[PDB]
Amino acid sequence: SMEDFVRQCFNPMIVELAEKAMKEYGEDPKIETNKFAAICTHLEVCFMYSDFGKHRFEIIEGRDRIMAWTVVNSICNTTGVEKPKFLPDLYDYKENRFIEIGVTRREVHIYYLEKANKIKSEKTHIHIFSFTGEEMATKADYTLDEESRARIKTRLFTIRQEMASRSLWDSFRQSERGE
Numbered sequence: 001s002m003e004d005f006v007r008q009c010f011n012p013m014i015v016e017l018a019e020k021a022m023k024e025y026g027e028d029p030k031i032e033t034n035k036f037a038a039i040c041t042h043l044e045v046c047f048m049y050s051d052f053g054k055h056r057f058e059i060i061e062g063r064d065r066i067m068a069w070t071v072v073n074s075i076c077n078t079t080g081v082e083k084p085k086f087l088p089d090l091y092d093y094k095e096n097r098f099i100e101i102g103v104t105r106r107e108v109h110i111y112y113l114e115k116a117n118k119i120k121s122e123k124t125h126i127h128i129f130s131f132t133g134e135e136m137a138t139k140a141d142y143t144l145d146e147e148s149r150a151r152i153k154t155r156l157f158t159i160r161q162e163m164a165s166r167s168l169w170d171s172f173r174q175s176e177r178g179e
């Protein structure tokens with residue numbers, strides 16, 4: 001059911017990446033369905049984010065760990081930027097900074113506090129999106145123009161409403177898994 005929805009609303013490439021991420025962690029997407037959906041949603045948000053930007057953004061999320069760290073190392077060696085302790089989601093060649101993307105079912109400020117306390121690196125920019133059209137970013141610097149952020153918010157709200165139409169939203173939002 002939730003698996004059916006995930007396979008019907010996300011393109012096969014994102015679904016395959018999410019299935020691979022869960023097989024890496026060791027979880028079955030048919031039991032941990034909310035994890036599955038959250039991972040698909042986060043991947044799709046990262047890909048939209050990087051695609052709205054001469055390519056401005058370098059996608060790090062969605063890569064196997066070897067290639068992710070290869071990309072991070074190459075960026076740090078060609079820019080002198082400090083090497084993050086956690087694999088970030090994108091690199092911004094325009095602002096020259098790593099971006100950690102957050103998609104939460106909780107209030108954006110709660111999840112922002114959580115992620116900022118986690119990464120504890122004053123150089124990784126944080127951008128939190130909610131399923132309610134809310135966002136919170138480091139220094140209120142949202143990076144993207146209004147149209148791209150609007151499209152991301154629209155896609156997230158649409159995912160939420162598609163879950164609600166299938167009676168999947170209550171379970172998904174009451175779970176923190178995937179964040």
Ligand SMILES: O=C(O)c1[nH]ccc(=O)c1O
Pocket residue numbers: 042061087088089101102103178179
């Ligand atoms: O990189 C990850 O593994 C990860 N995990 C949970 C939430 C995120 O936003 C994220 O980027």
Ligand SMILES: [Mn+2]
Pocket residue numbers: 061087088089
């Ligand atoms: Mn990530």
Ligand SMILES: [Mn+2]
Pocket residue numbers: 042089100101102103
């Ligand atoms: Mn992220």
